[PDB]
Amino acid sequence: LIVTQTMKGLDIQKVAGTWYSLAMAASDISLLDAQSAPLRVYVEELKPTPEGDLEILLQKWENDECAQKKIIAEKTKIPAVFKIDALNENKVLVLDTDYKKYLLFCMENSAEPEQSLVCQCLVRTPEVDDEALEKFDKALKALPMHIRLSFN
Amino acid sequence: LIVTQTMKGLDIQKVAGTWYSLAMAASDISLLDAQSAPLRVYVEELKPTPEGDLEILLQKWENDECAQKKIIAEKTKIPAVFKIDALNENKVLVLDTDYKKYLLFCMENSAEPEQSLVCQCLVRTPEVDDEALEKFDKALKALPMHIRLSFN
């Protein structure tokens, strides 16, 4: 990705609260194949820290169960871009959000060979409005996604 | 599906030969989730019979292997629609084909509750032309697909 593809003027504090993963897409099918997929996670809550970092509560399938995992995405010099400084480095990129209805973001695996990207369309409530899905579609047209999922 | 959504004037004998599954889509994510998916099969060859029936050679993942399975789709009173008269009945619907480059078809699970549909975009050769993918997209717009896959 590029800086021109991330959001400008993002205020991390306003994304706080609950979210629902409405749709996902990835540049490689295996990234989201069967539940056990490492990047196939569902965002449940975003908790910005007073430090400007981003705490992410996620639910993932684990042994017939729905396991909760909390990861911390650290701010970087680039706004809208956060780093999960784990053994395996991943970046969280915020593409766009209106704070009150939707949020679009991607997770990238820099270590991997070519661009390994997985993006999600999040919404505040399961309301019957498709502006979020439309925006998601708009932002994904520029990227080479090989798999696309939509939750009911 | 409806009769107006299937192909008119299809000549089953002309689809004979090898094909490659280029893209798939389904009305329900679970239908194509992880390799083990029952409708996640790759068409390798179509063999029409002198009787007008359709023999389909498919490859599917099975125990770390790529298993070959041959199914027979029997003609019905409706052209372009074939029935796999197994314990679990499934129908094969041919949406459109130009015989020499692409073929679009769906497999439906009538027994299941709501419409359980899985469609595929097949091509004769892996040539660098996207008319097949475009047509596939065009035909899927009318259907409610929740997952979409594209092979490299």
PDB file of C-alpha atoms in Angstrom:
ATOM      1  CA  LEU A   1       0.000   0.000   0.000  1.00  0.00           C
ATOM      2  CA  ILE A   2       0.874   3.689  -0.235  1.00  0.00           C
ATOM      3  CA  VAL A   3       0.296   6.746   1.969  1.00  0.00           C
ATOM      4  CA  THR A   4      -2.208   8.088  -0.547  1.00  0.00           C
ATOM      5  CA  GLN A   5      -4.311   4.963   0.045  1.00  0.00           C
ATOM      6  CA  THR A   6      -4.551   5.413   3.807  1.00  0.00           C
ATOM      7  CA  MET A   7      -6.790   7.903   5.558  1.00  0.00           C
ATOM      8  CA  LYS A   8      -5.739  11.495   6.126  1.00  0.00           C
ATOM      9  CA  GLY A   9      -6.629  13.286   9.352  1.00  0.00           C
ATOM     10  CA  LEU A  10      -7.630  10.144  11.256  1.00  0.00           C
ATOM     11  CA  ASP A  11      -8.454  10.712  14.925  1.00  0.00           C
ATOM     12  CA  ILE A  12      -7.794   7.329  16.547  1.00  0.00           C
ATOM     13  CA  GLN A  13      -9.807   8.269  19.671  1.00  0.00           C
ATOM     14  CA  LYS A  14     -13.074   8.379  17.710  1.00  0.00           C
ATOM     15  CA  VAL A  15     -12.918   4.729  16.561  1.00  0.00           C
ATOM     16  CA  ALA A  16     -13.232   3.524  20.152  1.00  0.00           C
ATOM     17  CA  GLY A  17     -16.076   1.155  20.863  1.00  0.00           C
ATOM     18  CA  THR A  18     -17.721  -1.901  19.419  1.00  0.00           C
ATOM     19  CA  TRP A  19     -17.614  -2.939  15.775  1.00  0.00           C
ATOM     20  CA  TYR A  20     -18.827  -5.889  13.696  1.00  0.00           C
ATOM     21  CA  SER A  21     -16.848  -7.482  10.860  1.00  0.00           C
ATOM     22  CA  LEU A  22     -19.245  -7.338   7.911  1.00  0.00           C
ATOM     23  CA  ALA A  23     -17.016  -8.459   5.049  1.00  0.00           C
ATOM     24  CA  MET A  24     -13.452  -9.572   4.427  1.00  0.00           C
ATOM     25  CA  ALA A  25     -11.152  -9.959   1.425  1.00  0.00           C
ATOM     26  CA  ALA A  26      -7.558 -11.077   0.941  1.00  0.00           C
ATOM     27  CA  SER A  27      -4.849 -11.052  -1.719  1.00  0.00           C
ATOM     28  CA  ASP A  28      -4.363 -14.816  -1.242  1.00  0.00           C
ATOM     29  CA  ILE A  29      -7.078 -17.470  -0.786  1.00  0.00           C
ATOM     30  CA  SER A  30      -5.165 -19.404   1.882  1.00  0.00           C
ATOM     31  CA  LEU A  31      -5.150 -16.360   4.155  1.00  0.00           C
ATOM     32  CA  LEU A  32      -8.879 -16.856   4.816  1.00  0.00           C
ATOM     33  CA  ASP A  33      -9.609 -20.450   3.736  1.00  0.00           C
ATOM     34  CA  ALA A  34     -10.849 -22.460   6.744  1.00  0.00           C
ATOM     35  CA  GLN A  35     -11.600 -20.965  10.189  1.00  0.00           C
ATOM     36  CA  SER A  36      -8.053 -21.888  11.232  1.00  0.00           C
ATOM     37  CA  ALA A  37      -6.835 -19.137   8.891  1.00  0.00           C
ATOM     38  CA  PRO A  38      -4.349 -16.918  10.808  1.00  0.00           C
ATOM     39  CA  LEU A  39      -5.716 -13.659   9.384  1.00  0.00           C
ATOM     40  CA  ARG A  40      -9.338 -14.757   9.573  1.00  0.00           C
ATOM     41  CA  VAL A  41     -10.316 -12.837  12.699  1.00  0.00           C
ATOM     42  CA  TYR A  42     -13.444 -10.919  13.699  1.00  0.00           C
ATOM     43  CA  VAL A  43     -13.080  -7.485  15.301  1.00  0.00           C
ATOM     44  CA  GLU A  44     -15.235  -7.086  18.379  1.00  0.00           C
ATOM     45  CA  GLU A  45     -13.844  -3.898  19.888  1.00  0.00           C
ATOM     46  CA  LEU A  46     -11.264  -1.149  19.324  1.00  0.00           C
ATOM     47  CA  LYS A  47      -9.691   0.519  22.375  1.00  0.00           C
ATOM     48  CA  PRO A  48      -7.384   3.442  21.606  1.00  0.00           C
ATOM     49  CA  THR A  49      -4.938   4.217  24.423  1.00  0.00           C
ATOM     50  CA  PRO A  50      -4.216   7.712  25.801  1.00  0.00           C
ATOM     51  CA  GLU A  51      -0.780   7.157  24.228  1.00  0.00           C
ATOM     52  CA  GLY A  52      -2.293   6.995  20.763  1.00  0.00           C
ATOM     53  CA  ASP A  53      -1.801   3.250  20.363  1.00  0.00           C
ATOM     54  CA  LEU A  54      -4.571   0.874  19.348  1.00  0.00           C
ATOM     55  CA  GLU A  55      -5.817  -2.079  21.372  1.00  0.00           C
ATOM     56  CA  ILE A  56      -7.847  -4.529  19.284  1.00  0.00           C
ATOM     57  CA  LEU A  57     -10.180  -7.161  20.748  1.00  0.00           C
ATOM     58  CA  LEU A  58     -10.738  -9.979  18.265  1.00  0.00           C
ATOM     59  CA  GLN A  59     -12.561 -13.298  18.250  1.00  0.00           C
ATOM     60  CA  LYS A  60     -11.119 -16.285  16.427  1.00  0.00           C
ATOM     61  CA  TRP A  61     -12.101 -19.914  16.049  1.00  0.00           C
ATOM     62  CA  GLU A  62     -10.024 -22.176  18.286  1.00  0.00           C
ATOM     63  CA  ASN A  63     -10.709 -25.832  19.070  1.00  0.00           C
ATOM     64  CA  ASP A  64     -14.456 -25.872  18.410  1.00  0.00           C
ATOM     65  CA  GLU A  65     -14.544 -22.589  20.341  1.00  0.00           C
ATOM     66  CA  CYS A  66     -14.637 -18.844  19.760  1.00  0.00           C
ATOM     67  CA  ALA A  67     -11.414 -17.607  21.359  1.00  0.00           C
ATOM     68  CA  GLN A  68     -10.887 -13.967  22.294  1.00  0.00           C
ATOM     69  CA  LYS A  69      -7.471 -12.435  21.616  1.00  0.00           C
ATOM     70  CA  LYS A  70      -6.204  -8.949  22.408  1.00  0.00           C
ATOM     71  CA  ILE A  71      -3.461  -7.421  20.305  1.00  0.00           C
ATOM     72  CA  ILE A  72      -1.833  -4.022  20.578  1.00  0.00           C
ATOM     73  CA  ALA A  73      -1.128  -2.030  17.430  1.00  0.00           C
ATOM     74  CA  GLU A  74       1.493   0.635  18.136  1.00  0.00           C
ATOM     75  CA  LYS A  75       1.426   4.050  16.491  1.00  0.00           C
ATOM     76  CA  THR A  76       4.105   4.804  13.903  1.00  0.00           C
ATOM     77  CA  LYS A  77       5.377   8.039  12.370  1.00  0.00           C
ATOM     78  CA  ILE A  78       2.726   7.556   9.705  1.00  0.00           C
ATOM     79  CA  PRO A  79      -0.811   8.375  10.857  1.00  0.00           C
ATOM     80  CA  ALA A  80      -3.419   5.686  10.129  1.00  0.00           C
ATOM     81  CA  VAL A  81      -0.650   3.058  10.126  1.00  0.00           C
ATOM     82  CA  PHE A  82      -0.019   0.924  13.209  1.00  0.00           C
ATOM     83  CA  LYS A  83       2.494  -1.812  13.936  1.00  0.00           C
ATOM     84  CA  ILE A  84       1.939  -5.063  15.794  1.00  0.00           C
ATOM     85  CA  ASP A  85       5.524  -5.528  16.990  1.00  0.00           C
ATOM     86  CA  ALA A  86       5.359  -9.295  17.543  1.00  0.00           C
ATOM     87  CA  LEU A  87       7.841 -11.981  16.475  1.00  0.00           C
ATOM     88  CA  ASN A  88       6.014 -11.859  13.141  1.00  0.00           C
ATOM     89  CA  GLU A  89       5.502  -8.198  12.287  1.00  0.00           C
ATOM     90  CA  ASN A  90       2.144  -7.122  10.880  1.00  0.00           C
ATOM     91  CA  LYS A  91       0.864  -3.650  10.083  1.00  0.00           C
ATOM     92  CA  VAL A  92      -2.664  -2.323  10.525  1.00  0.00           C
ATOM     93  CA  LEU A  93      -3.690   0.262   7.958  1.00  0.00           C
ATOM     94  CA  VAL A  94      -6.846   2.343   8.260  1.00  0.00           C
ATOM     95  CA  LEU A  95      -8.124   3.072   4.757  1.00  0.00           C
ATOM     96  CA  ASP A  96     -11.217   5.106   5.661  1.00  0.00           C
ATOM     97  CA  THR A  97     -13.870   5.639   8.342  1.00  0.00           C
ATOM     98  CA  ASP A  98     -16.673   8.053   9.191  1.00  0.00           C
ATOM     99  CA  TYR A  99     -16.371   7.028  12.843  1.00  0.00           C
ATOM    100  CA  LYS A 100     -20.118   6.654  13.373  1.00  0.00           C
ATOM    101  CA  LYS A 101     -21.029   3.957  10.846  1.00  0.00           C
ATOM    102  CA  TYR A 102     -18.115   2.195   9.179  1.00  0.00           C
ATOM    103  CA  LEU A 103     -14.390   1.593   9.267  1.00  0.00           C
ATOM    104  CA  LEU A 104     -12.276  -0.025   6.566  1.00  0.00           C
ATOM    105  CA  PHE A 105      -8.840  -1.417   7.405  1.00  0.00           C
ATOM    106  CA  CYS A 106      -6.236  -3.911   6.223  1.00  0.00           C
ATOM    107  CA  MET A 107      -3.617  -6.070   7.896  1.00  0.00           C
ATOM    108  CA  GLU A 108      -0.386  -6.607   5.985  1.00  0.00           C
ATOM    109  CA  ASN A 109       2.348  -9.244   6.386  1.00  0.00           C
ATOM    110  CA  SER A 110       5.574  -7.399   5.508  1.00  0.00           C
ATOM    111  CA  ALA A 111       7.874 -10.353   6.228  1.00  0.00           C
ATOM    112  CA  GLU A 112       6.091 -12.572   3.665  1.00  0.00           C
ATOM    113  CA  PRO A 113       7.286 -12.426   0.020  1.00  0.00           C
ATOM    114  CA  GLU A 114       4.853 -10.401  -2.116  1.00  0.00           C
ATOM    115  CA  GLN A 115       2.157  -8.171  -0.632  1.00  0.00           C
ATOM    116  CA  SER A 116       0.119 -10.402   1.665  1.00  0.00           C
ATOM    117  CA  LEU A 117      -2.922  -8.302   2.504  1.00  0.00           C
ATOM    118  CA  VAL A 118      -6.197  -8.985   4.303  1.00  0.00           C
ATOM    119  CA  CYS A 119      -8.846  -6.251   4.610  1.00  0.00           C
ATOM    120  CA  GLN A 120     -12.123  -5.900   6.511  1.00  0.00           C
ATOM    121  CA  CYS A 121     -15.270  -3.776   6.372  1.00  0.00           C
ATOM    122  CA  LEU A 122     -16.429  -2.989   9.921  1.00  0.00           C
ATOM    123  CA  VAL A 123     -19.715  -1.383  10.948  1.00  0.00           C
ATOM    124  CA  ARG A 124     -21.057   0.001  14.227  1.00  0.00           C
ATOM    125  CA  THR A 125     -24.440  -1.729  14.040  1.00  0.00           C
ATOM    126  CA  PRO A 126     -25.902  -4.480  11.803  1.00  0.00           C
ATOM    127  CA  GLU A 127     -28.318  -1.927  10.299  1.00  0.00           C
ATOM    128  CA  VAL A 128     -29.752  -2.607   6.823  1.00  0.00           C
ATOM    129  CA  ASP A 129     -27.616  -0.031   5.004  1.00  0.00           C
ATOM    130  CA  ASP A 130     -25.061  -0.889   2.302  1.00  0.00           C
ATOM    131  CA  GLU A 131     -22.924   2.278   2.224  1.00  0.00           C
ATOM    132  CA  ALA A 132     -20.214   0.372   4.129  1.00  0.00           C
ATOM    133  CA  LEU A 133     -20.150  -2.508   1.634  1.00  0.00           C
ATOM    134  CA  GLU A 134     -20.103  -0.031  -1.261  1.00  0.00           C
ATOM    135  CA  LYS A 135     -17.173   1.920   0.159  1.00  0.00           C
ATOM    136  CA  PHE A 136     -15.379  -1.390   0.854  1.00  0.00           C
ATOM    137  CA  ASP A 137     -15.894  -2.389  -2.774  1.00  0.00           C
ATOM    138  CA  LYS A 138     -14.644   1.003  -3.962  1.00  0.00           C
ATOM    139  CA  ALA A 139     -11.424   0.766  -1.936  1.00  0.00           C
ATOM    140  CA  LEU A 140     -10.728  -2.857  -2.958  1.00  0.00           C
ATOM    141  CA  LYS A 141     -10.912  -2.156  -6.710  1.00  0.00           C
ATOM    142  CA  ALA A 142      -7.359  -0.792  -6.600  1.00  0.00           C
ATOM    143  CA  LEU A 143      -6.060  -3.932  -4.878  1.00  0.00           C
ATOM    144  CA  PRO A 144      -5.609  -7.496  -6.215  1.00  0.00           C
ATOM    145  CA  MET A 145      -7.906  -9.541  -3.958  1.00  0.00           C
ATOM    146  CA  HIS A 146      -8.367 -13.253  -4.779  1.00  0.00           C
ATOM    147  CA  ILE A 147     -11.035 -14.053  -2.188  1.00  0.00           C
ATOM    148  CA  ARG A 148     -14.026 -12.065  -0.945  1.00  0.00           C
ATOM    149  CA  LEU A 149     -16.391 -12.939   1.924  1.00  0.00           C
ATOM    150  CA  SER A 150     -19.647 -11.371   3.131  1.00  0.00           C
ATOM    151  CA  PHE A 151     -21.265 -12.225   6.448  1.00  0.00           C
ATOM    152  CA  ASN A 152     -25.049 -12.381   6.490  1.00  0.00           C
TER     153      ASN A 152
ATOM    154  CA  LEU B   1     -32.736 -20.309 -10.686  1.00  0.00           C
ATOM    155  CA  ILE B   2     -35.130 -19.889 -13.605  1.00  0.00           C
ATOM    156  CA  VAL B   3     -35.229 -21.117 -17.213  1.00  0.00           C
ATOM    157  CA  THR B   4     -34.524 -17.593 -18.433  1.00  0.00           C
ATOM    158  CA  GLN B   5     -31.220 -17.714 -16.533  1.00  0.00           C
ATOM    159  CA  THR B   6     -29.974 -20.886 -18.206  1.00  0.00           C
ATOM    160  CA  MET B   7     -28.580 -21.089 -21.711  1.00  0.00           C
ATOM    161  CA  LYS B   8     -30.817 -21.475 -24.741  1.00  0.00           C
ATOM    162  CA  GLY B   9     -29.774 -23.679 -27.651  1.00  0.00           C
ATOM    163  CA  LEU B  10     -26.959 -25.442 -25.789  1.00  0.00           C
ATOM    164  CA  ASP B  11     -25.302 -28.262 -27.729  1.00  0.00           C
ATOM    165  CA  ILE B  12     -23.875 -30.524 -25.017  1.00  0.00           C
ATOM    166  CA  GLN B  13     -21.557 -32.291 -27.506  1.00  0.00           C
ATOM    167  CA  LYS B  14     -19.499 -29.130 -28.057  1.00  0.00           C
ATOM    168  CA  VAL B  15     -18.444 -28.754 -24.394  1.00  0.00           C
ATOM    169  CA  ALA B  16     -16.483 -32.005 -24.564  1.00  0.00           C
ATOM    170  CA  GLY B  17     -12.840 -31.795 -23.618  1.00  0.00           C
ATOM    171  CA  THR B  18     -10.621 -30.291 -20.983  1.00  0.00           C
ATOM    172  CA  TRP B  19     -11.465 -27.260 -18.868  1.00  0.00           C
ATOM    173  CA  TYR B  20      -9.864 -25.360 -15.985  1.00  0.00           C
ATOM    174  CA  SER B  21     -11.780 -23.937 -13.017  1.00  0.00           C
ATOM    175  CA  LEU B  22     -10.794 -20.264 -12.998  1.00  0.00           C
ATOM    176  CA  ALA B  23     -13.132 -18.851 -10.360  1.00  0.00           C
ATOM    177  CA  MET B  24     -15.858 -20.002  -8.001  1.00  0.00           C
ATOM    178  CA  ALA B  25     -18.615 -18.379  -5.948  1.00  0.00           C
ATOM    179  CA  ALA B  26     -21.320 -19.666  -3.617  1.00  0.00           C
ATOM    180  CA  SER B  27     -24.485 -18.457  -1.905  1.00  0.00           C
ATOM    181  CA  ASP B  28     -23.125 -19.686   1.451  1.00  0.00           C
ATOM    182  CA  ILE B  29     -19.552 -19.350   2.775  1.00  0.00           C
ATOM    183  CA  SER B  30     -19.456 -22.849   4.278  1.00  0.00           C
ATOM    184  CA  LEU B  31     -20.025 -24.395   0.855  1.00  0.00           C
ATOM    185  CA  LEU B  32     -16.458 -23.464  -0.140  1.00  0.00           C
ATOM    186  CA  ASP B  33     -14.658 -22.760   3.159  1.00  0.00           C
ATOM    187  CA  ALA B  34     -11.764 -25.223   3.584  1.00  0.00           C
ATOM    188  CA  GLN B  35     -10.640 -27.729   0.915  1.00  0.00           C
ATOM    189  CA  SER B  36     -12.886 -30.323   2.572  1.00  0.00           C
ATOM    190  CA  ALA B  37     -15.859 -28.327   1.269  1.00  0.00           C
ATOM    191  CA  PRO B  38     -18.272 -30.744  -0.496  1.00  0.00           C
ATOM    192  CA  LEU B  39     -18.986 -28.375  -3.392  1.00  0.00           C
ATOM    193  CA  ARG B  40     -15.405 -27.165  -3.668  1.00  0.00           C
ATOM    194  CA  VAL B  41     -14.377 -29.222  -6.689  1.00  0.00           C
ATOM    195  CA  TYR B  42     -12.237 -28.466  -9.741  1.00  0.00           C
ATOM    196  CA  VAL B  43     -13.488 -29.502 -13.183  1.00  0.00           C
ATOM    197  CA  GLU B  44     -10.834 -31.254 -15.224  1.00  0.00           C
ATOM    198  CA  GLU B  45     -12.873 -32.686 -18.080  1.00  0.00           C
ATOM    199  CA  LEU B  46     -16.409 -32.854 -19.498  1.00  0.00           C
ATOM    200  CA  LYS B  47     -17.444 -35.977 -21.432  1.00  0.00           C
ATOM    201  CA  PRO B  48     -20.891 -35.817 -23.029  1.00  0.00           C
ATOM    202  CA  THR B  49     -22.354 -39.248 -23.807  1.00  0.00           C
ATOM    203  CA  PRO B  50     -24.006 -40.228 -27.115  1.00  0.00           C
ATOM    204  CA  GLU B  51     -27.177 -40.389 -24.993  1.00  0.00           C
ATOM    205  CA  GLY B  52     -26.974 -36.685 -24.248  1.00  0.00           C
ATOM    206  CA  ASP B  53     -25.915 -37.135 -20.627  1.00  0.00           C
ATOM    207  CA  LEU B  54     -22.900 -35.422 -19.104  1.00  0.00           C
ATOM    208  CA  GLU B  55     -19.920 -37.157 -17.529  1.00  0.00           C
ATOM    209  CA  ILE B  56     -17.849 -34.818 -15.355  1.00  0.00           C
ATOM    210  CA  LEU B  57     -14.276 -35.538 -14.245  1.00  0.00           C
ATOM    211  CA  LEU B  58     -13.416 -33.538 -11.135  1.00  0.00           C
ATOM    212  CA  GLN B  59     -10.464 -33.271  -8.777  1.00  0.00           C
ATOM    213  CA  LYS B  60     -10.998 -32.741  -5.068  1.00  0.00           C
ATOM    214  CA  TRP B  61      -8.741 -32.560  -2.043  1.00  0.00           C
ATOM    215  CA  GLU B  62      -8.783 -35.799  -0.057  1.00  0.00           C
ATOM    216  CA  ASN B  63      -6.382 -36.783   2.720  1.00  0.00           C
ATOM    217  CA  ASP B  64      -3.429 -34.597   1.733  1.00  0.00           C
ATOM    218  CA  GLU B  65      -4.127 -35.755  -1.829  1.00  0.00           C
ATOM    219  CA  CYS B  66      -5.844 -34.605  -5.007  1.00  0.00           C
ATOM    220  CA  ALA B  67      -8.561 -37.211  -5.553  1.00  0.00           C
ATOM    221  CA  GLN B  68     -10.257 -37.691  -8.915  1.00  0.00           C
ATOM    222  CA  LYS B  69     -14.010 -38.309  -8.938  1.00  0.00           C
ATOM    223  CA  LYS B  70     -16.310 -39.003 -11.873  1.00  0.00           C
ATOM    224  CA  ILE B  71     -19.965 -38.065 -11.663  1.00  0.00           C
ATOM    225  CA  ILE B  72     -22.702 -38.466 -14.238  1.00  0.00           C
ATOM    226  CA  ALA B  73     -25.183 -35.651 -14.779  1.00  0.00           C
ATOM    227  CA  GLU B  74     -28.299 -36.980 -16.511  1.00  0.00           C
ATOM    228  CA  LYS B  75     -30.247 -34.946 -19.050  1.00  0.00           C
ATOM    229  CA  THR B  76     -33.676 -33.673 -18.018  1.00  0.00           C
ATOM    230  CA  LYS B  77     -36.637 -32.340 -19.991  1.00  0.00           C
ATOM    231  CA  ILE B  78     -35.076 -28.911 -19.588  1.00  0.00           C
ATOM    232  CA  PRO B  79     -32.071 -28.290 -21.845  1.00  0.00           C
ATOM    233  CA  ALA B  80     -28.964 -26.952 -20.081  1.00  0.00           C
ATOM    234  CA  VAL B  81     -30.169 -28.552 -16.831  1.00  0.00           C
ATOM    235  CA  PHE B  82     -28.771 -31.903 -15.704  1.00  0.00           C
ATOM    236  CA  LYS B  83     -29.474 -34.061 -12.674  1.00  0.00           C
ATOM    237  CA  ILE B  84     -27.004 -35.992 -10.554  1.00  0.00           C
ATOM    238  CA  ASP B  85     -29.428 -38.666  -9.340  1.00  0.00           C
ATOM    239  CA  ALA B  86     -27.492 -39.685  -6.219  1.00  0.00           C
ATOM    240  CA  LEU B  87     -28.782 -40.225  -2.675  1.00  0.00           C
ATOM    241  CA  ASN B  88     -28.393 -36.457  -2.327  1.00  0.00           C
ATOM    242  CA  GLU B  89     -29.812 -34.897  -5.481  1.00  0.00           C
ATOM    243  CA  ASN B  90     -27.910 -32.036  -7.096  1.00  0.00           C
ATOM    244  CA  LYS B  91     -28.583 -30.228 -10.353  1.00  0.00           C
ATOM    245  CA  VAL B  92     -26.037 -28.898 -12.834  1.00  0.00           C
ATOM    246  CA  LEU B  93     -27.125 -25.765 -14.656  1.00  0.00           C
ATOM    247  CA  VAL B  94     -25.263 -24.351 -17.642  1.00  0.00           C
ATOM    248  CA  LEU B  95     -25.651 -20.572 -17.599  1.00  0.00           C
ATOM    249  CA  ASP B  96     -23.623 -19.728 -20.713  1.00  0.00           C
ATOM    250  CA  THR B  97     -20.736 -20.891 -22.910  1.00  0.00           C
ATOM    251  CA  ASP B  98     -19.132 -20.062 -26.249  1.00  0.00           C
ATOM    252  CA  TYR B  99     -17.746 -23.603 -26.395  1.00  0.00           C
ATOM    253  CA  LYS B 100     -14.259 -22.527 -27.464  1.00  0.00           C
ATOM    254  CA  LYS B 101     -13.167 -20.318 -24.562  1.00  0.00           C
ATOM    255  CA  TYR B 102     -15.413 -20.364 -21.508  1.00  0.00           C
ATOM    256  CA  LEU B 103     -18.261 -22.133 -19.775  1.00  0.00           C
ATOM    257  CA  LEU B 104     -20.235 -20.893 -16.784  1.00  0.00           C
ATOM    258  CA  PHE B 105     -22.254 -23.333 -14.682  1.00  0.00           C
ATOM    259  CA  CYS B 106     -23.766 -23.793 -11.232  1.00  0.00           C
ATOM    260  CA  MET B 107     -24.494 -26.746  -8.981  1.00  0.00           C
ATOM    261  CA  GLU B 108     -27.612 -26.515  -6.834  1.00  0.00           C
ATOM    262  CA  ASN B 109     -28.650 -28.463  -3.717  1.00  0.00           C
ATOM    263  CA  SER B 110     -32.445 -28.772  -4.018  1.00  0.00           C
ATOM    264  CA  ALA B 111     -32.878 -30.866  -0.862  1.00  0.00           C
ATOM    265  CA  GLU B 112     -31.270 -28.174   1.338  1.00  0.00           C
ATOM    266  CA  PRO B 113     -33.537 -25.421   2.757  1.00  0.00           C
ATOM    267  CA  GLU B 114     -33.059 -22.157   0.833  1.00  0.00           C
ATOM    268  CA  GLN B 115     -31.258 -21.968  -2.508  1.00  0.00           C
ATOM    269  CA  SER B 116     -27.831 -23.492  -1.922  1.00  0.00           C
ATOM    270  CA  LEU B 117     -25.896 -22.602  -5.056  1.00  0.00           C
ATOM    271  CA  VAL B 118     -22.256 -22.908  -6.097  1.00  0.00           C
ATOM    272  CA  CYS B 119     -21.096 -21.611  -9.497  1.00  0.00           C
ATOM    273  CA  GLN B 120     -17.864 -21.843 -11.491  1.00  0.00           C
ATOM    274  CA  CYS B 121     -16.172 -20.033 -14.371  1.00  0.00           C
ATOM    275  CA  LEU B 122     -14.367 -22.569 -16.578  1.00  0.00           C
ATOM    276  CA  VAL B 123     -11.952 -21.819 -19.413  1.00  0.00           C
ATOM    277  CA  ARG B 124     -10.337 -23.941 -22.125  1.00  0.00           C
ATOM    278  CA  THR B 125      -6.810 -22.599 -21.640  1.00  0.00           C
ATOM    279  CA  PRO B 126      -5.136 -20.420 -18.964  1.00  0.00           C
ATOM    280  CA  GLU B 127      -4.692 -17.642 -21.553  1.00  0.00           C
ATOM    281  CA  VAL B 128      -4.337 -14.044 -20.317  1.00  0.00           C
ATOM    282  CA  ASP B 129      -7.837 -12.931 -21.329  1.00  0.00           C
ATOM    283  CA  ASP B 130     -10.509 -11.760 -18.869  1.00  0.00           C
ATOM    284  CA  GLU B 131     -13.689 -12.103 -20.958  1.00  0.00           C
ATOM    285  CA  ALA B 132     -14.526 -15.261 -18.975  1.00  0.00           C
ATOM    286  CA  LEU B 133     -14.167 -13.527 -15.602  1.00  0.00           C
ATOM    287  CA  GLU B 134     -16.220 -10.578 -16.871  1.00  0.00           C
ATOM    288  CA  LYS B 135     -19.055 -12.787 -18.093  1.00  0.00           C
ATOM    289  CA  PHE B 136     -18.918 -14.700 -14.780  1.00  0.00           C
ATOM    290  CA  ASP B 137     -19.249 -11.411 -12.909  1.00  0.00           C
ATOM    291  CA  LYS B 138     -22.146 -10.350 -15.139  1.00  0.00           C
ATOM    292  CA  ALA B 139     -24.088 -13.570 -14.511  1.00  0.00           C
ATOM    293  CA  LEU B 140     -23.457 -13.535 -10.735  1.00  0.00           C
ATOM    294  CA  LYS B 141     -24.837 -10.007 -10.229  1.00  0.00           C
ATOM    295  CA  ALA B 142     -28.375 -11.411 -10.308  1.00  0.00           C
ATOM    296  CA  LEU B 143     -27.556 -13.998  -7.635  1.00  0.00           C
ATOM    297  CA  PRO B 144     -26.849 -13.567  -3.892  1.00  0.00           C
ATOM    298  CA  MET B 145     -23.297 -14.915  -3.545  1.00  0.00           C
ATOM    299  CA  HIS B 146     -21.588 -14.576  -0.134  1.00  0.00           C
ATOM    300  CA  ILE B 147     -18.147 -15.865  -1.122  1.00  0.00           C
ATOM    301  CA  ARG B 148     -16.074 -15.373  -4.268  1.00  0.00           C
ATOM    302  CA  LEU B 149     -12.766 -17.051  -5.179  1.00  0.00           C
ATOM    303  CA  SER B 150     -10.300 -16.481  -8.027  1.00  0.00           C
ATOM    304  CA  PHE B 151      -7.482 -18.873  -8.852  1.00  0.00           C
ATOM    305  CA  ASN B 152      -4.217 -17.313  -9.971  1.00  0.00           C
TER     306      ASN B 152
END
